[PDB]
Symmetry: C3
Subunit: 168 residues, 3 copies
C-alpha cells in the first residue's frame, strides 16, 4: 500500500483532463534494448482524460514493434480504459485521435491519426480495466527516429496524443 499510494501519486501527477497528453520516455536506449531483446516488448503510459469527468485513456508503445511492425517500426497504440464516470458517457467512444512522435528540433514530427470504428470492441464501454488497444502498428520506421535524428535527445523521446473533443 506504499507502492500503491506511490503509484497513485505518480498517476495523479501525470493525468491531464483536456484530451492532450505528452508522454516523456526516459532511459530510452535501455528500454529500446529491452524491447529488441524481447524482455519488455511494450510499455503503458499513465492515464489521461477528455474532460474532468470524461473518458479514461492511456497509450501503449512497442519500441521494437508489434504485429506488422514487429522489428521494423515503432508501434504506438491508443487504449480506452474503464473510467470512474463511464456510466455518464456516450458509447461507443468515437473521438478522432491523433498520435505524434515529437521532433526535438521541432521541424518534422511523426504524425498519424485515426477515426475509431463504432463496430470495434476497442471502443465499447469497458468491462475490464482496459479494452483491446488499437492504433498504429507501423507508426514510425525504427530507422527514422531511434537510429539518431532529432527524435531522440539526451536519451529521451516525447510522445504526444491529442483527442478531438468535438461533440463533448
Amino acid at each position: 500500500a506504499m507502492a500503491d499510494l506511490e503509484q497513485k501519486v505518480l498517476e495523479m501527477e501525470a493525468s491531464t483532463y483536456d484530451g492532450v497528453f505528452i508522454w516523456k520516455i526516459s532511459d530510452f536506449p535501455r528500454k529500446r534494448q529491452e524491447a529488441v531483446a524481447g524482455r519488455i516488448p511494450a510499455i503503458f503510459s499513465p492515464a489521461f482524460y477528455t474532460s474532468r469527468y470524461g473518458y479514461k485513456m492511456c497509450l501503449r508503445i512497442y519500441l521494437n514493434g508489434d504485429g506488422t511492425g514487429r522489428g521494423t517500426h515503432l508501434s504506438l497504440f491508443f487504449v480506452v480504459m474503464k473510467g470512474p464516470n463511464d456510466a455518464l458517457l456516450r458509447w461507443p467512444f468515437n473521438q478522432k485521435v491523433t498520435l505524434m512522435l515529437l521532433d526535438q528540433n521541432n521541424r518534422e514530427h511523426v504524425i498519424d491519426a485515426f477515426r475509431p470504428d463504432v463496430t470495434s470492441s476497442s471502443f465499447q464501454r469497458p468491462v475490464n480495466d482496459m479494452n483491446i488497444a488499437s492504433g498504429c502498428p507501423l507508426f514510425c520506421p525504427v530507422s527514422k527516429m531511434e537510429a539518431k535524428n532529432s527524435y531522440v535527445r539526451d536519451d529521451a523521446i516525447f510522445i504526444k496524443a491529442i483527442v478531438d473533443l468535438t461533440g463533448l
Copy 2:
C-alpha cells in the same frame, strides 16, 4: 500518519477548481441502509473550489433524509468551508448553487437550485472548518430515485453541483 497523507491524496484527487463537481457514491445500497438504520445519517463529499484560489466547498447528503425530509426524501446540502485563501475573497459567499441527482438514462435529472441569503450564518466567512450547511431537505422523494428508476445503476448514484461564477 499514513492515514493523514492517504487522506490528502484522496482529497486532491477529487478536487476541482471551476465550480463544477460530480460526486459518485458507490456501495449505495449499503450506505442507504446505514442511513435508514440511523447508524450513519449523513455523508460529506470531498472538497471542490470556485477557482484555483477560490471558495472551498463540499456537499452533505442524507440518504434517508434530514429534518422536514427525514424518512421521506433524500436531503442534499451545500457547505461553505474555511478555505486557505478566504482572506482574499468577498464575504458573504453569495453565488447561486445548483444541485443535481443525475439520471443515468440521461433523460430526467433531479434538479434544484438556491440563492444564498446574505443574512444567513451559512455564508459568512468561516471561523470553524465548516459553516452550517444549507440546501434542500426535500431534494428527492425516496420513492423516485433509490427505489429503482434510472438514478441508481450498478449500485451507484451521481450527485452534481454547479456553482454559478457570475462576478468572480
Copy 3:
C-alpha cells in the same frame, strides 16, 4: 522516504499550470524574525508552470532583504527551474513577469514587473535544478508592509506572480 512522498504531494498540491501563482506565507512574524536574525534569510516557494507542459518556475523571497535591499526592503525574486519538458520549449525564457504583495484590504497592492533579459544567464535553458534568480531587490519597504498596514493579516501575507503568456 515518507518525507520524500509527502514532499511530492505538497508540491503537486501547490502547482498551477496557467502562469498565475498565489503564495500564502503563514507564521509571518516568526519567519520575519528568522530573517532579521540572519538564521533563514530566504525562502523558496513551491513550483508552478506556464502551461500543462510549460516552463517550471518558483519564487524566492527575503523577508529582511537581499543585496541593495538587505535590511531595508522585502526582496522578491523569480526563478526559472529545470522543467521536465525543457527540451520542447523555446530558450531563453523571455516572458514578462509581474510580482505582487497583496493588500488584504484590497485597495493598494505592491506591484512590480520586469522583462527578462535575453542575455542573462538567469533565463537560459537550465543545466542545474535552478538558474540564478532575478527580480526585485527593492520590492517593498519593510516599513510599508510588515510594520502593520493591510498586507499582513492574521500573521500571513500573500505573494502573487503572473507570467504573461504572450507567444506561448
